[PDB]
Amino acid sequence: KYDIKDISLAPQGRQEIEWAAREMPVLKQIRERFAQEKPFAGIRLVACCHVTTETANLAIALHAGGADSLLIASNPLSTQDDVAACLVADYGIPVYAIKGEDNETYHRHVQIALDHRPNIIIDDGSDVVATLVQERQHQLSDIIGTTEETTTGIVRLRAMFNDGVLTFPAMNVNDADTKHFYDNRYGTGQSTLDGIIRATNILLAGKTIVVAGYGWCGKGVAMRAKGMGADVIVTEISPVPAIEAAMDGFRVMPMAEAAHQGDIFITVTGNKHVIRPEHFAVMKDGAIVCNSGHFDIEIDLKSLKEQAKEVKEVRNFTEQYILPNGKSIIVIGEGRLVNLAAAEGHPSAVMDMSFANQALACEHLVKNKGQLEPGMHSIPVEVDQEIARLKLQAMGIAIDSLTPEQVEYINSWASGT
Amino acid sequence: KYDIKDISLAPQGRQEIEWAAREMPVLKQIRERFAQEKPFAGIRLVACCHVTTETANLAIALHAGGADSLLIASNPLSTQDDVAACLVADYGIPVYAIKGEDNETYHRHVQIALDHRPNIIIDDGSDVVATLVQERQHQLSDIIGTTEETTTGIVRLRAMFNDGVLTFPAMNVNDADTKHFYDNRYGTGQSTLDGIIRATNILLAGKTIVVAGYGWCGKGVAMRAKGMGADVIVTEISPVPAIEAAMDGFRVMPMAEAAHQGDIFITVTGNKHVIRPEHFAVMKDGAIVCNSGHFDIEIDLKSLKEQAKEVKEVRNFTEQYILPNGKSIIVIGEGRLVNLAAAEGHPSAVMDMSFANQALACEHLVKNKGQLEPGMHSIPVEVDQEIARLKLQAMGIAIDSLTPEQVEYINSWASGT
Amino acid sequence: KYDIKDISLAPQGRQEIEWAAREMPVLKQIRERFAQEKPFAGIRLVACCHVTTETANLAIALHAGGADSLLIASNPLSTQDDVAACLVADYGIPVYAIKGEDNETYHRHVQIALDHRPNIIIDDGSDVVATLVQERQHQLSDIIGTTEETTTGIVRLRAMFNDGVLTFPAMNVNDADTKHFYDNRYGTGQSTLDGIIRATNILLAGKTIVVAGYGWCGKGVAMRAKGMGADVIVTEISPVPAIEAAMDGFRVMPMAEAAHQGDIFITVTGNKHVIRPEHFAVMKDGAIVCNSGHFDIEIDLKSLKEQAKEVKEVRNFTEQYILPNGKSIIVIGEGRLVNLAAAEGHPSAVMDMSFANQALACEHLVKNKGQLEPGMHSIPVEVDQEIARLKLQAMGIAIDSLTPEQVEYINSWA
Amino acid sequence: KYDIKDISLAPQGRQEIEWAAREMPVLKQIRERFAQEKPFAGIRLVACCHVTTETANLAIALHAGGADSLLIASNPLSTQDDVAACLVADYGIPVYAIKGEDNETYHRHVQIALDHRPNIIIDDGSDVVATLVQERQHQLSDIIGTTEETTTGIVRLRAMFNDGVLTFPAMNVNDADTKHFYDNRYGTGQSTLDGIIRATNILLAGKTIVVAGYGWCGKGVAMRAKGMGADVIVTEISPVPAIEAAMDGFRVMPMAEAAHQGDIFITVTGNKHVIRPEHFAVMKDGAIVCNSGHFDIEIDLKSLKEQAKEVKEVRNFTEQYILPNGKSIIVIGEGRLVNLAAAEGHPSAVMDMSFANQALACEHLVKNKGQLEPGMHSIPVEVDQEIARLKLQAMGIAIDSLTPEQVEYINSWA
Ligand SMILES: NC(=O)c1ccc[n+]([C@@H]2O[C@H](COP(=O)([O-])OP(=O)(O)OC[C@H]3O[C@@H](n4cnc5c(N)ncnc54)[C@H](O)[C@@H]3O)[C@@H](O)[C@H]2O)c1
Ligand SMILES: NC(=O)c1ccc[n+]([C@@H]2O[C@H](COP(=O)([O-])OP(=O)(O)OC[C@H]3O[C@@H](n4cnc5c(N)ncnc54)[C@H](O)[C@@H]3O)[C@@H](O)[C@H]2O)c1
Ligand SMILES: NC(=O)c1ccc[n+]([C@@H]2O[C@H](COP(=O)([O-])OP(=O)(O)OC[C@H]3O[C@@H](n4cnc5c(N)ncnc54)[C@H](O)[C@@H]3O)[C@@H](O)[C@H]2O)c1
Ligand SMILES: NC(=O)c1ccc[n+]([C@@H]2O[C@H](COP(=O)([O-])OP(=O)(O)OC[C@H]3O[C@@H](n4cnc5c(N)ncnc54)[C@H](O)[C@@H]3O)[C@@H](O)[C@H]2O)c1
Ligand SMILES: Nc1ncnc2c1ncn2[C@@H]1O[C@H](CO)[C@@H](O)[C@H]1O
Ligand SMILES: Nc1ncnc2c1ncn2[C@@H]1O[C@H](CO)[C@@H](O)[C@H]1O
Ligand SMILES: Nc1ncnc2c1ncn2[C@@H]1O[C@H](CO)[C@@H](O)[C@H]1O
Ligand SMILES: Nc1ncnc2c1ncn2[C@@H]1O[C@H](CO)[C@@H](O)[C@H]1O
Ligand SMILES: [Cl-]
Ligand SMILES: [Cl-]
Ligand SMILES: [Cl-]
Ligand SMILES: [Cl-]
Ligand SMILES: [Rb+]
Ligand SMILES: [Rb+]
Ligand SMILES: [Rb+]
Ligand SMILES: [Rb+]
Ligand SMILES: [Rb+]
Ligand SMILES: [Rb+]
Ligand SMILES: [Rb+]
Ligand SMILES: [Rb+]
């Protein structure tokens, strides 16, 4: 069984997946080894991911390794229906994912996924792992381990750990060097603006753009907003990233001060209610708000809907809320990750490395079953470094190597004058 | 006793030190607390640092804390003679440092410094700590601990540790967030180009600039070279920084390929012989080479002097080597850190944080004497974070703070859908 | 009446036109003056433009001015069918424009437009004016004047003038300060990369991108490619813009040297066959070629078709040509204007100033009928400056004004 | 004979002049043609320029051309004393220029220069030409023509023309493509920040920097300030450059709003009193003000002096004004050209093209004696283009050339 929009989209989905593969050579090399070695023979796997052409290439690599996989959507609005159709029709992979599905459907998919009795859970935001631990304690004996794709899910796993309920190994994929140094920064930077421009066709040049958060994602978004000619305001809660943002040329201020000035607001904090009613109240007429953090809770949309006297779709992915004072607030993507909701997410070039990490993390869990302590686990350095070497080579870039004389110099300490 | 160029420069040096203090408010606040609390009462201290207006403000803060300090130069060419005169004449601090001193003099200063029988050694490159361990094993009982300012010295300390001879605590100042995130990146970026432009008055726009190394320093130099209109080539030995440099818009290649194309070469690798005779051989006529890593050994200057049939000073800090084929290679600063040799080093704004870390690391060593294991020690997070908070405040920048509702959200794991 | 795809798209086109109008405040003010003063009463007008939400707002303003207008597509791939439906159904403006129309349909539409016997012709690339001068010498008595939107069209008019056949006033809209300083530069800079990304979802960071031409468009394309993390090569034929590109941090080289290195090629020259058979042969496997200058002839696609053993459609707006050695060349938008073929063209903020220039140029032609010398006329300085003043004000930006003593000091020399 | 600081500096000045010549290949080629053709034989010439290693290379080229030249300083703070020594001692060129000379010495030098009875005057800011027109109406019969190096001077000449006293040809060197596209933009962009950093060693990253003016100089200053990590505010009086600055990512606002926010203020307007008493009163404690336009009058330093209770010299080229409330305002270079007062002026790469224009303009004036209309003359296009071609070639950059079919296609319109 499966639950998708339209099985007839599989031929289009097959073509989209092959296009995306053009820039996933590291994952393709992993798939080919998996086809030989079958690391997941006999393993049941659940993946809660954005159902995109990039996720399909990861699902196909796990299929080649022998995994009995079931895929559900990580977000109601990021699903690519033609991809879902292709995975069902061409690979026989159960997919429960419909673009635009409601909340009841999403939760029912999570339940169907746990009924698959997975041994490995690939999660993106930790919804499925949190549901497992809260509602399916009786299933924990099935678990070899889990993996977590994104920053928000890592925070949830720490909270699970500190609550004493992370009773199995969980691979921190997000914090691998070849994941958040490129995916979170360069990918979010391009695809966030992609989603905004597809939604609105607004000229970014000459606009004031407010980026909440200056971590890996915020650095990318601010960098690319600036590259497209915007005046960039950064907000923060920590002084180290705040100083960095100033020395990168951006204006740093509290959100209450930014709210008067922004034309476009982008949240990338991983936090709740970063943009609040006290902020909507002072925004310019026609201000655009959107979110590129994992959950929409970064913008208090519930309060906006309550205050507004009217909402209407004015363009694809674009809603205009009209406030009782007659001013309007424009929301893109209903507050969901704008790159995936209004565009196609990150280019496959960065997802190659992110999903290479996912594939090898799953292999790590199986090859080390019964030898990993419960709790969080970093990607092994050798694996992280090998992904980077292979990606650099596939990009056609050559670099230098240390000579034996340089190796000797590093190990020396008496010399230097 | 002391060993300086000219005591009569103290009035000029006093004015230079006060100017530099305009942007060192975090260190000034530390000095004022030190004046009250006298943490270094009865402590003998040796500092091997670049004798600059920034180092003077740190020396004055240690003096206010009661330290019996002696200062020697970290590099023969970075000394500011008027600063040396002021510290001797106005504070009575022994300074052994002459701009342009030869190697015999430098080594004799190191010996005089160890004869001071220090309890704390502040080192910049680890020369004095390596000399202590190799030649003064009988003095180790004096040592409360040491600190290390820069990346090259950290590498030496690891080699000492792995050789089993790091038998005392050593504070890793360089790797504090408020040190290498700003000093190594934003400071080196501006002051490296400062030194090059003061030496030559070359238009950087339209030149090809080759940056060897894409760590904290290389990121800054490349960023600012690009900001000044240069075509930037990056060389590397590791794939993670190499990919970053490409996604930042720079051309990544092996040095053998870069050597044909560069107009200006800047080494910031911390490594030996990054630019070798096989590279000089193919450089454009008039190519400029310089170094911003701690030691000049990054450029094989010994071989260049041997091949050249002639050398002459053509401008301040600027030497033209003429090769037997009649082509010329231009060397700035005799291969020594070009920012300090041809200009004035980093602006005091970043050295405020670097030397705030130095001052509190020394206080940490004394307040925890007899409770630190031998080996390397990171700056405590609370200290690192407090420097950043105080610097952000002194820069006049305000940011947000987490509400209790957001704190609750972070500690929650069942919520998120 | 009209020739369009589906009139049932009119309500969607209306919503799209209204969305675009949000950032066309200057043209809005012009439309409202036009509806009162009716400067185009009794005037027939043909517009040959990209049939976009921005052109619609222009057509709506001319219609408010009394103009009996007829619109045809400047390019078969840039037409927005919902916009064509809205203009016909909501405004009664005849539109001859179907997205994807073939060449015969295009040329038929141009003949239908000339049968309107226009007094004013707004052109984009000069196709209709050249046809008029060539085939309809008897209709020149109708012509009060024409306008030309784009750089390629200005060059063709210059050739028309030098040939001695430019026997009427033509307003050079493209060279207005408030046109090519912004439209050609910032407009093309964003919308060109927009089209590439919508076609391919390729990561620009880390790629070598080759920009042919460093005029207004190339400056904009190179600036935004750099801002998205790309390594930028520029090619040129003139030394002055070539030195600018180097001092802007870009590599400058002949296209034959760049052909071995680029991952993405963008032509913005206005000239013919800038990317040539001998470049395709040495390109990297999977290199992308696209064009942002007015006509697709910037790329020698005919040669690529005969060099390739196979061509497949692999993504929207994207063709993969496979050469006998198995290497691929990717073409976006069949070589037509990549911003308008694979995306939506310039954001309406810049089209506000370009189309304010069109509207006031048409007013200029009518208010000066029988008084203008034949040939090309630049936009009047006061018109151009007042557009900039209205736009800056609409952007919410305030600037300074000289004091009486500062004005005095300018006019002193002692 | 001459009036200089110390002739014993000649050998050091020679080494400095030779170093600068390395990146003046175009002027080198001109000098070598001049030494053969001797276009200035029997011609007397006055040059009022910044006495730098770059101006020396110009003077050396004119001397090779047979010119009987006399050089005086354009600005008391920009003079390089070793260069003045080398020109006198090694070339026998009379130089009247001492770094730090007072106002009376400057005006005396200008009178000495006019007593040379020059046939050609090379000016920078138009001080000597205006004095000639004002006080030496009897000497106009000597004048074959003059040249003007900088934007401020072109404005003064326009006022001279409109007043009716520009009774001779003046070559507009500043507006040559190969002059203000590079000198004014990339030259001032680097050398202005160079002067600030040499004066203060302040970190630019993290600072708000206010650039008054977004012409060629302001574009360059803003571009490089941004590249060094600064938050850039731009002020303007014209909407067209104001919209450019916004679309370049900069904040645009009136100077009175910027005065509360800037850490560093840079004036590049050519106008009088752009930073005013009411701005000083609201500036942040320790704000830095400096000027990069030709004259120091861009900043109302007289008002600052009367608002301050105290002034101290705290660094080279740096004054600290302390206001009654204890807040400080920092002035660099006494408000004179910060790049030339606190550093060395433009790198010689761009002065190569500016001074190639000077040299060929002087040749133009002499080769066209008695044939030129009175008034201002632009640099001839072929001169300007050939300078760009020689410079690009000297930079080692190769570009493309149109093929015969591409030339054909330009000239077709059908
Ligand atoms: N849309 C995408 O494709 C995509 C990709 C990767 C990650 N993400 C998501 O983006 C979010 C950010 O991830 P990251 O890797 O940048 O995290 P990060 O830990 O590197 O950075 C988050 C930053 O936000 C700051 N911050 C926290 N609360 C804030 C507040 N109230 N106001 C302002 N700043 C605040 C923190 O100080 C920190 O610097 C997460 O939800 C992550 O899951 C999205
Ligand atoms: N001049 C200054 O004021 C200043 C300031 C801080 C540090 N430094 C010095 O600069 C140097 C670099 O410090 P950092 O903090 O950037 O170190 P880092 O560890 O952050 O980076 C060094 C980088 O160089 C690369 N590398 C090593 N050998 C290489 C080689 N042969 N070719 C190319 N790349 C190579 C490494 O892969 C790494 O990415 C050190 O000597 C440090 O002491 C100088
Ligand atoms: N797609 C769009 O939305 C859009 C917008 C505006 C203009 N355009 C088109 O873009 C083209 C260029 O317009 P522009 O305003 O930048 O023109 P321009 O005259 O300002 O600049 C064109 C540049 O191309 C250079 N060039 C010419 N032939 C060349 C060749 N063979 N190789 C390399 N460089 C060459 C020229 O020297 C010049 O610098 C025109 O066809 C114009 O109609 C398109
Ligand atoms: N220091 C140097 O080496 C150097 C080099 C070249 C030119 N200059 C000088 O720089 C100045 C400017 O030259 P340019 O070529 O950029 O001139 P420009 O004519 O191209 O630009 C000047 C700009 O300043 C603006 N402006 C005028 N008054 C203003 C005011 N009160 N407030 C704000 N903006 C105002 C104008 O609108 C214009 O955009 C001149 O004095 C020129 O002589 C100095
Ligand atoms: N194209 C994509 N396909 C799948 N996952 C994606 C894509 N773009 C972004 N993501 C992932 O979504 C996560 C946020 O939910 C990020 O960690 C990122 O890796
Ligand atoms: N102005 C300066 N004064 C003192 N030390 C400096 C200065 N500029 C750079 N340094 C230091 O020199 C070290 C390299 O030897 C760097 O770690 C850096 O912190
Ligand atoms: N959205 C758009 N609507 C109409 N014309 C456009 C649009 N984007 C670009 N153009 C115009 O198309 C011309 C190229 O033929 C450019 O001169 C430009 O003004
Ligand atoms: N190094 C220099 N030598 C001579 N003139 C210079 C130099 N730097 C800038 N200038 C000139 O000074 C003028 C300003 O008066 C500018 O037009 C510029 O051409
Ligand atoms: Cl592998
Ligand atoms: Cl403290
Ligand atoms: Cl109007
Ligand atoms: Cl010549
Ligand atoms: Rb896709
Ligand atoms: Rb409501
Ligand atoms: Rb060593
Ligand atoms: Rb100093
Ligand atoms: Rb030798
Ligand atoms: Rb949570
Ligand atoms: Rb549109
Ligand atoms: Rb010089």
C-alpha distances (whole Å) from A193 to each of A268, A342, B126, C174, D56 are: 13, 10, 47, 29, 52
Q: Which of residues 175-204 of B touch A (CB under 8 A)?
A: 177-178, 181-182, 186
Nearest ligand 2 atom, CA B219: 16
Length of chain C, in residues = 414
CA neighbor of B113 nearest in space, from B191, B51, B206: B51
Q: Which helix (H) or strand (E) holds C44?
A: strand C44-49
DSSP annotation of C380: P
- Measured between alpha carbons, how far apart are the two ends of chain A, in Å? 72
**For ligand 7, atom 16, which residue shows the shortest CA distance?**
C150
| Token output for B27 | 């260190």
Distances (CA, A) of D380 to A317, D29, D173: 56, 19, 10
Name the residue among D53, D48, D240, D201 with its Cα closest to residue D129: D48
The domains of chain D are located at 1-185+346-397, 186-345
Give the CA-trace dihedral at B110, B114, B119, B122, to 10 degrees.
0
Q: Write the secondary structure of chain D as one string of H (helix), E (strand) and C (coil).
A: CCECCCHHHHHHHHHHHHHHHCCCHHHHHHHHHHHHHCCCCCCEEEEEECCCHHHHHHHHHHHHCCCEEEEEECCCCCCCHHHHHHHHHHHCCCEECCCCCCHHHHHHHHHHHHHCCCCEEEECCCHHHHHHHHHCHHHHHHCCEEEECCHHHHHHHHHHHHCCCCCCEEEECCCCHHHHCCHHHHHHHHHHHHHHHHHHCCCCCCCEEEEECCCHHHHHHHHHHHHCCCEEEEECCCHHHHHHHHHCCCEECCHHHHCCCCCEEEECCCCCCCECHHHHCCCCCCEEEEECCCCHHHECHHHHHHHCCEEEEEECCEEEEECCCCCEEEEEHHHCCHHHHHCCCCCHHHHHHHHHHHHHHHHHHHHCCCCCCCEEEECCHHHHHHHHHHHHHHCCCCCCCCCHHHHHHHCCCC
C205 touches chain D (CB under 8 A): no
Q: How many Å lie between the centroid of ligand 5 and the Cα of residue B411?
A: 24
| CA A122, A127, A129, A132 torsion-angle sign | negative
Distance from CA of A247 to the nearest CA of B (A): 7
The C-alpha atoms of residue A234 and residue B398 are separated, in whole angstroms, by 11
Judging by DSSP bridges, how do beta strands A120-123 and A287-291 pair with one another? unpaired
B239–A152 CB contact, under 8 Å: no
> How many whole angstroms separate alpha carbon C61 and alpha carbon D63?
64
**DSSP 3-state assignment of B404?**
helix
Cα–Cα distances in Å, from D79 out to D4, D5, D98, D121, D319?
10, 10, 6, 19, 20
The answer to whether A156 touches B416, Cβ cutoff 8 Å, is yes
Residue B152 annotated as binding? yes
Experimental method: X-ray
Q: Which two tokens stand for residue A341?
A: 């909701």
B-chain CB neighbours of A354 within 8 Å are none
Cβ atoms of C208 and B249 closer than 8 Å = no
Contacts of B32 (CB under 8 A, 6+ apart): B64
Helix or strand (DSSP H, E) at A121: strand A120-123
Among A30, A75, A29, residue whose Cα is nearest residue A52: A75
- Ligand 4 pocket, CB under 6 A: C 400; D 150-152, 180, 184, 188, 212-218, 235-238, 241, 268-271, 274, 292-294, 337, 339, 346
- Across the beta sheet with D44-49, the strand order is D95-96, D68-73, D44-49, D120-123, D145-148, D169-172, D375-378
Q: Which two tokens stand for residue C291?
A: 């064009």
Angle at B216 between CA B215 and CA B220, to 5 degrees: 110
Instruction: Decide if D136 touches C, using CB distance below 8 A.
Output: no
A192 by DSSP, 3-state: which? helix
Residue D239's CB is within 10 A of a number of other CB atoms, namely 23
Residue B216 carries which side chain, given as an amino acid letter? Answer: W
Task: Give the number of the ligand closest to the Cα of residue B295.
Answer: 2
C-alpha distance from residue A112 to each of A67, A70, A72, A117, A126 (Å): 17, 9, 9, 9, 16
3-state DSSP call for residue C18?
helix
In DSSP notation, B49-85 reads E--SHHHHHHHHHHHHTT-EEEEEESSTTT--HHHHH
- What whole-number distance in Å separates Cα of residue D35 and Cα of residue D249? 49
User: Given the CA of residue D20, which atom of ligand 8 is nearest to it?
Assistant: 1
Determine contact, residues D147/D170, Cβ cutoff 8 Å.
yes
**Closest residue, chain C, to A185 (C-alpha):** C205
Provide the strand spans (E) within C260-374.
Answer: 264-267, 287-291, 310-315, 318-322, 328-332
In the complex, which subunits touch A with 3 or more CB pairs below 8 angstroms? B, C, D
Residues with Cβ within 8 Å of residue B371, at least 6 apart in sequence: none
How far apart are alpha carbons B247 and C7 in whole angstroms?
Answer: 46
With an 8 Å Cβ cutoff, are B228 and D16 in contact?
A: no
Q: By three-state DSSP, how is residue A94 classified?
A: coil
**C177: Cα separation from own chain's centroid:** 15
Radius of gyration of chain C (CA): 22
CA of B268 to the centre of ligand 2 (A): 4
Atom of ligand 1 nearest to the CA of A294: 41
Annotated binding residue at A413? no
Closest of A360, A346, A347 to residue A390, by C-alpha:
A360
Q: Which distant-in-sequence residues (6+ apart) come within 8 Å of B39 by Cβ?
A: B65, B66, B362, B363, B366, B367
SS (HEC) of D50-91? CCCHHHHHHHHHHHHCCCEEEEEECCCCCCCHHHHHHHHHHH
Question: Are B54 and B348 contacting, i.e. CB atoms less than 8 angstroms apart?
Answer: yes
* Chain C neighbors of A223, CB-CB under 8 A: 229
Question: Are the C-beta atoms of B74 and B54 separated by less than 8 Å?
Answer: no
Identify which of A107, A125, A397 has the shortest CB distance to residue B246: A397
**Other C-beta atoms within 10 Å of B235: how many?**
30
Is B262 among the annotated ligand-binding positions? no
Work out the angle at residue A351's Cα, subtended by the Cα atoms of residues C331 and A267, and round it to the nearest 5 degrees: 105
d(CA C25, CA C390) in angstroms, rounded, equals: 8
Q: Which of C20, C23, C29 is nearest to C395 (CA)?
A: C23
* Ligand having the closest approach to the CA of B200: 20
Contact D364, D183 (CB under 8 A): no
Residue of C nearest to A14 (CA): C314
**Preferred mutation among B247, B252, B263, B264 to probe C, highest tally of C CBs within 10 A:** B247
Which residue of chain B has the CA closest to C252? Answer: B206
Nearest CA in chain D to C251: D397
Of C203, C206, C251, the CB nearest to B231: C251
B82 annotated ligand binder? no
Which residues of chain A have a CB within 8 Å of the CB of B397? 242-243, 246, 252-253
DSSP letter, residue B324 = T
Which amino acid would we find at residue C33? R
From the CA of D344, how far away is ligand 20's center (Å)? Answer: 5
- Give the CA distances from residue C248 to residues A299, B30, D5, D210, in Å, rounded to whole numbers and listed in that order: 39, 44, 40, 22
Residue with CA closest to ligand 2 atom 18: B215
Q: Do B226 and C249 touch (CB under 8 A)?
A: yes
- Please answer whether residues A37 and A65 qualify as being in contact, where contact means their C-beta atoms are separated by less than 8 angstroms: yes
Angle value at C-alpha D188, between D105 and C413, nearest 5 degrees: 50
Q: How far apart are CA D133 and CA D401, in angstroms?
A: 47
Instruction: Spell out the residues 6+ positions from residue A258 whose beta carbon is closer than 8 angstroms to its own.
Output: A210, A233, A235, A265
Contacts of A243 in chain D (CB under 8 A): 206
DSSP state of B187: I
Which residues of chain C lie closer than 8 angstroms to B229, CB-CB?
247-249
Q: Does A246 touch chain D (CB under 8 A)?
A: yes
* Number of other residues whose CB lies within 10 A of the CB of residue C367: 10
Nearest-angstrom CA–CA distance, D356 and A210: 47
Cβ contact D185:D220 at 8 Å? yes
Compute the distance from residue A81 Cα to the ligand 18 centre, in Å. 28
The string of DSSP letters for C295-311 reads: SGGGB-HHHHHHH-SEE
Rg (CA), chain B: 22
Residues A194, A225: contact at Cβ < 8 Å?
A: no
Do D226 and A249 count as a contact with CB atoms less than 8 A apart? yes
Phi, psi of D75 (to 5 degrees): -160, 130
In the reported structure, the alpha carbon of residue C230 is separated from the centroid of ligand 13 by a whole-number distance in angstroms of 21
Resolution (A): 2.0
Distance CA A34, CA C317 (A): 34
* B226, burial (CB in 10 Å: exposed 0-12, middle 13-18, buried 19+): buried
3-class DSSP state for residue A171? strand
What is the spatial distance between Cα B59 and Cα B65, in angstroms, rounded to a whole number? 10
Return d(Cα C382, Cα B187) in angstroms, integer.
48
Between chain C and chain D, the number of residue pairs with CB atoms below 8 A apart is 144
Q: CA nearest D272 in C: which residue?
A: C406
Distance (Å) from CA B234 to ligand 16 centroid: 30
Strand partners, D45: D69, D120
What is the chain D residue with the closest CA to C156? D413
- How far off is chain B from A61, nearest CA to CA, in Å? 24
Q: Cβ contact (<8 Å) for D348 and B19?
A: no
Q: Which residues of D touch C182 (CB under 8 A)?
A: 243, 247
Query: C-alpha angle with apex C251: C248 to C252, nearest 5 degrees?
Result: 100
Query: Both tokens of residue D99?
Result: 């770094």
**Cα(A273)–Cα(A281) distance, integer angstroms:** 15
Tokens coding C37: 């003063």
Ligand nearest to the CA of C316: 13
Distances (CA, A) of D234 to A233, A366, D250: 17, 60, 7
- Per the CB < 8 A criterion, the answer to whether D262 and D283 are in contact is yes
- Is the distance from the beta carbon of residue D183 to the nearest atom of ligand 8 less than 6 Å? yes
Helix axes C216-227, C239-247, angle to 10 degrees: 20
The count of other CB atoms within 10 Å of the CB of residue D391 is 24
Q: Which of A262, A284, A298 is nearest to A328 (CA)?
A: A284
List all residues whose CB is within 6 A of at least one atom of ligand 6: B 50, 52, 54-55, 74, 124-125, 149-150, 183, 294, 337, 340, 345-346, 351, 354
